[PDB]
Amino acid sequence: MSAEVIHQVEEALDTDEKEMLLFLCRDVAIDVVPPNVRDLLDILRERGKLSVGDLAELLYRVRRFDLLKRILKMDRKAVETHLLRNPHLVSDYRVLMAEIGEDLDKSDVSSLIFLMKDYMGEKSFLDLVVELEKLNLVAPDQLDLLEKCLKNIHRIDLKTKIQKYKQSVQ
Amino acid sequence: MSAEVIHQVEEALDTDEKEMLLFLCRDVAIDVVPPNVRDLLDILRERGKLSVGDLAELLYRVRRFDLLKRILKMDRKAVETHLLRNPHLVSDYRVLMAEIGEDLDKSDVSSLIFLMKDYMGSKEKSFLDLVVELEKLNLVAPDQLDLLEKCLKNIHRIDLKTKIQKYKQSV
Amino acid sequence: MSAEVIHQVEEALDTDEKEMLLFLCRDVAIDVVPPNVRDLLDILRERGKLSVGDLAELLYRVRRFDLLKRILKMDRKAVETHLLRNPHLVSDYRVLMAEIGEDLDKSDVSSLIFLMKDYMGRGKISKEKSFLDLVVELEKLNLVAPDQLDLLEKCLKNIHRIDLKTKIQKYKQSV
Amino acid sequence: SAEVIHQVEEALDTDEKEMLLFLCRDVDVVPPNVRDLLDILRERGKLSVGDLAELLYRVRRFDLLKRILKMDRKAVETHLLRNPHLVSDYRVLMAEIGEDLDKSDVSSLIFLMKDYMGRGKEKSFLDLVVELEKLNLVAPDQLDLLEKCLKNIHRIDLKTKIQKYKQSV
Amino acid sequence: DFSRNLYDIGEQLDSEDLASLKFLSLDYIPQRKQEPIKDALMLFQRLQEKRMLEESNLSFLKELLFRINRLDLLITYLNTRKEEMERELQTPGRAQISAYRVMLYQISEEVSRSELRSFKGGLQEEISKCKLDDDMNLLDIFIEMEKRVILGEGKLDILKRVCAQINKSLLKIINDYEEFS
Amino acid sequence: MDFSRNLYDIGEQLDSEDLASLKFLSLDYIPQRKQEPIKDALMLFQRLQEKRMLEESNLSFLKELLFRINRLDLLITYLNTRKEEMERELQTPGRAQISAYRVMLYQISEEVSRSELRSFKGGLQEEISKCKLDDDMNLLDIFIEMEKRVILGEGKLDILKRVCAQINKSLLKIINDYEEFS
Amino acid sequence: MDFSRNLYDIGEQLDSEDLASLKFLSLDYIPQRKQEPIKDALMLFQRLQEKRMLEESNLSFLKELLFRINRLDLLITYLNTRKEEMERELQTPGRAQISAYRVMLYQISEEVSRSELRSFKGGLQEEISKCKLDDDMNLLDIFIEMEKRVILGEGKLDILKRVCAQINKSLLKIINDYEEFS
Amino acid sequence: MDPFLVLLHSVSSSLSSSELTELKFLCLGRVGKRKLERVQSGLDLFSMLLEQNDLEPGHTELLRELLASLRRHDLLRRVDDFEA
Amino acid sequence: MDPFLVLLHSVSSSLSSSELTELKFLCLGRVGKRKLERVQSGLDLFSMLLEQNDLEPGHTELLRELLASLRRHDLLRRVDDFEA
Amino acid sequence: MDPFLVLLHSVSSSLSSSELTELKFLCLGRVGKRKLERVQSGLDLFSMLLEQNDLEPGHTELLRELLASLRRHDLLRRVDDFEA
């Protein structure tokens, strides 16, 4: 709504939170890719897509309820009801990717990198996902290359999440 | 009453106490998140909130009395009287959390995080980091202490529950 | 003199005596805290407070007389005369603390930290400690001082070790 | 055979790039990008598949030799005997020595060499040979200072390697 | 179909086996690149770099797994038997690992903790007190001896004398290795 | 009702020896690399939770594990299961998630005293010769070591029988009872 | 400072057997896992302090423990309590923080001879099945092992009655007195 | 106290095997059989009895009462001289 | 090679198990029970008593008093010959 | 020197545990208690003594009198024959 609110929001976040938000806003940033999160917020504001509900949605998707209550004077229930009523800006596929990436270990992601380096030509799971998307191998409609890869590393728990998402969308 | 005592304070304190100092000063600097201690002290000095009494109180909270006797040339009784008369900067909540985190050994924080994994998402993860993370989700606040008290009571640590209840009785 | 002798001394000391040397050198270099022996020796050399006599005195205090002959080509008589004719590099309080800490085994530091659990923290002493670390912790809390030793003497008497109490009495009578 | 340079350089590592730059230091501002070397060698006419193969064999990346240049170790070894003058053997010896020191050894070496060197800092062994060359004391003919400093940290096999190289030429 | 098998093989190697393989691969892996290695996957990738371990060529990994006396991985994943491995290693032209490393590793196996302390207590003249540390493994002592060119292929006098001072059994291994060589 | 609280209470009743026994029994479903840093029951419970073998809805594996180490107290204090129910459940084929080989080896380990242990260790030198002669090696560790060198396996039980017949006879009875299945 | 000195001096006068008896008497208030590292009375005192049952102004549990193991000189020397003063306090209901079951088991343990211990092992070996045939284990370990396998429960006492009747008679007298108490 | 301990040692030094067995049978009521099982000398029995506070330096009537069963008046006179 | 230390060693080398048990009981007043539990030879007991400063080379009345109870005249003779 | 070191190792390799703790007590004054606490073998104690250069090939009388106090004349004879 105002420049100082978004400036405070950008100042109060963390580098990992900034990177996660930048990845999560990839779908809406197809036309222009802001290198900085402040640039992304400015672009969203200039296009009118940065609203109170939208900002609440992004802040809720990064689990920062303290900033939600301290700035927007809103709680979890209100933003959840807004999500239920108002349409979601970002597809739940990105939310699933972020949730999966939040749980993998550094050794696990290194093993995943070693396994998947055959197809492709330090790196976090989000970097691997975006690089794979650049190579057009995993898409919001195809997830076998991820389900099988996750099952191969003996982390069968996230296969349940992937299949639950796949069943839910259809 | 100069600008070089700050550098000596930075030099003397090790990183283990510097983390506790950062946590204690976290609440007052509600809009800035400095990575180091020197920049935080500079920010406090520029804001004008930092003073000789404030620095003495901060160094007394960290329990480094030799610095008070050496740099500020002040005793513990004088600073205690100053605290009794001059209202304190850091709230009792932060020092209570620091005291709670001091007595929890490495074998209990793992049990606590295993218990609390259902509410959130031998690696060195101190209790201060865990309480900061819990504060991020708006679960532990100076008004809401039910979760921490219940968790401490459920892992066979009752004196800390007594401390929490005493703090609640104080207010 | 050069850095080669400092390196040779550094590589000839095990991890046990490194802590002893660090505790002994706290008085001389109090502005900053060095992590390892090499950094401490480099700082004292750069500041000019380190010389052949200082290193000889430190090696005499750490009770490693063989290294004096092997490296510095000096005997115990030379360092004794140097100490006699020159001011002490380390206060006698530090060497007294080191002497006390030499005679306390692992079965007594537990008793000490149990008796003095009220003054200091509980999670700090969970990790394996030695008497030197306990002295450092007490000195941080301004409980033990070069001119104040009643509490430590009483604590040593409580664990039924009369000889160390007599040693404290002797040192206090000396000053 | 012209745009494969990007493919070759994209499959390398940071320390590998540093070693490559040290090797190419024999041939001005140091170009972080290999394209300057490409242009210089193409203008000189020295650029060839054989030179790139020899460089890759020196940096021990045989997988890229087979994948990109479609050649094995035997082919590049045979081509080496044709004219092994792309890089001086002094550089090869220095790189081989630098590949045999861990973090503790390089830290001890820099601490020892700080005696008469100005306070310039985290760096590797290959980042100190350049400093000594700037001071111009490690000559390809005389290496007395390097051997004296290396003997103090108790590494005698490398001293024997230095002696063998010196007596060979 | 191939990388998954390598990952499976690398998921059943503990720290001790990793250290043993790291020591066994000293000639083909320089010391500097060895420090970052913290798991079997990194070592496998590094060996893949030097083109001595590919999908088609698996001899080096086979004999490396056979050397540390772990035949379970040989029979289960790599699908080979002990007898044919012995027959292949009998040929002098198919042993990538030199007999020096094998002999030193066997000596390391044959030494218990008390004999390890006996070794550590009889070489103060050679190795610095700092480098001993009273917790280093025997292989670290051997590589430290190799660094100071005290224990070479042609220089086995000090090892032989410390063996004769400590244990008679190790002398049997040393002298049969010498007789074979 | 708190699943995590129940798991923590179950894990607080297990000492180092029972932890080692639990680690050995479930060796099939967790590789040795992931099994090195396990120092308390909480880490093992988390590792089992990763592979979808232990959760709030499905407890069919924890009950079996607690039954096999004869810790029947926890089966009734926390999980509220009597011995007869577990016996009937294990009697029905297809619900035994642990092969009879591991439980047979564990029973042989339990049925050996200290003198029998040292006699077994001394007699083991016939075939595998000797790796290191420290007596600190428990029977489970020795069994794992022998399994690594394909000395002892599912179809290879001759060495175990040969060594056991020199010491006791009830072990032969256990081995024959196991062989009766085949 | 006085309280810490008193606790340390009390702990300095307890040998290994008394430490084992104290450890057994307080299984309810100390979990199995936290009890293994205990090697001296000081760690037990610290653990009791953590549970907030042994405080500067709350010394009832220490008096009860020192009275149960029949050490009265320590009671009169430091805590300044006589036998009758503690007996009157313990007689009234509601102030007993130790279950009558545990004290009954300990009283049975004190009144068993070595030959009676061997016969006790022989009598009930049908259930343990030679797992604990070693004769170096005292009666308390046997009782703990029987408690693990839900044989000797609070409401399940038939095995104990049968074995004690087979061995002697006074043990049955103590068991009957305990039953009459309930 | 030191005189009490030295007196107790002196009186325990003159005991015999039959006297020890008789004293054990007499004192079987106080303590359990296990506590009285491995005792091999009167000194060990006195050390055991010092725990139950029944034998104290202030009052030693139980000691003389126990010794009276052995018809050893010399020990009674010795302890009487001690307590004097 | 202190004369007092070697004398204490020689004295402790000539004791027996029963004498050691009697000495352990005798010194129960000063040394605690837990410390006395782990002793196995008189050398350890003498070393432990050296801490409380009651037994020192300057004054050796405690050793003479202890040896008087054991009625070992040879060891007392050695003790008094050491002083001269 | 190396012959001195091998002689020291050989003489340390033939000491019993009782003789080991006997030697540990016998050198109480020279070496602090903490260092003696972690000594497990005679060779380690010999190295600890050599650290203070009181024991060396140039002056080995201390080891001679130590072995004499140990009542092991064979080891003393071997040590005397070493320099011959």
Numbering used by the authors:
A (entry chain I): 1 to 121, 128 to 176
B (entry chain J): 1 to 121, 126 to 175
C (entry chain K): 1 to 175
D (entry chain H): 2 to 28, 31 to 123, 127 to 175
E (entry chain A): 2 to 182
F (entry chain B), G (entry chain C): 1 to 182
H (entry chain Q), I (entry chain R), J (entry chain L): 1 to 84
Excerpt from the publication:
Fas-associated protein with death domain (FADD), procaspase-8, and cellular FLICE-inhibitory proteins (cFLIP) assemble through death-effector domains (DEDs), directing death receptor signaling towards cell survival or apoptosis. In this work, we present the crystal and cryo-EM structures of ternary FADD-Casp-8-cFLIP DED complexes, unveiling FADD-FADD, FADD-Casp-8, FADD-cFLIP, Casp-8-cFLIP, and cFLIP-cFLIP DED assemblies in a complex. The atomic coordinates depict how FADDDED and Casp-8tDED could assemble a helical 1:5 and 3:3 intermediate complexes, and how these FADD-Casp-8 intermediate complexes are targeted and capped by four cFLIPtDED molecules. The resultant helical Casp-8tDED-cFLIPtDED hetero-double layer appears to locally activate Casp-8.
To delve deeper into the assembly of the FADD-Casp-8-cFLIP complex, we conducted a study using wild-type (WT) full-length FADD, WT cFLIPtDED, and a full-length Casp-8 mutant with FGLG mutations, catalytic inactivity and processing deficiencies (F122G/L123G/C360A/D374A/D384A). This allowed us to reconstitute a ternary complex known as the FAFuL-C8FuL_FGLG_CADA-CF complex with an intact Casp-8 protease domain. To validate this observation, we produced a GraFix-stabilized version of the FAFuL-C8FuL_FGLG_CADA-CF complex and solved the cryo-EM structure at 3.7 Å resolution, named Complex B. Complex B confirmed the 3:3:4 model observed in Complex A, with invisible Casp-8 protease domain and FADD DD. Our triple-FADD complex structure unveils FADDDED-FADDDED and FADDDED-Casp-8tDED assemblies, by which three WT FADDDED molecules FAl, FAq, and FAr form a right-handed, type I interface-mediated trimer to interact with the left-handed Casp-8tDED trimer assembled by Casp-8tDED molecules C8a, C8b, and C8c. Notably, FADDDED interacts with the type Ib surface of C8tDED_FGLG DED2, although we introduced FGLG mutations on the type Ib surface, suggesting that the FL motif is dispensable for FADDDED-Casp-8tDED assembly. In addition, two FADDDED molecules FAq and FAr assemble like the Casp-8tDED molecule C8d in the single-FADD complex. Together they provide a type II and two type III surfaces, mimicking the type III-II-III CSS, for interaction with Casp-8tDED molecule C8c (d vs. 4e, f). In the 1:5:4 FAFuL_H9G-C8FGLG-CFH7G complex structure, three Casp-8tDED molecules C8c, C8d, and C8a provide, respectively, a type Ia, a type IIa, and a type IIIa surfaces, while FADDDED molecule FAl provides a type IIa and a type IIIa surfaces to complete the CBS to recruit cFLIPtDED_H7G molecule CFk. A similar CBS, which recruits WT cFLIPtDED molecule CFk (CFk-binding CBS), was also found in the 3:3:4 FAFuL-C8FuL_FGLG_CADA-CF complex structure, although Casp-8tDED C8d is replaced by two WT FADDDED molecules FAr and FAq. In fact, the triple-FADD structure demonstrates that FADD can physically impede Casp-8 filamentation at the upper end.
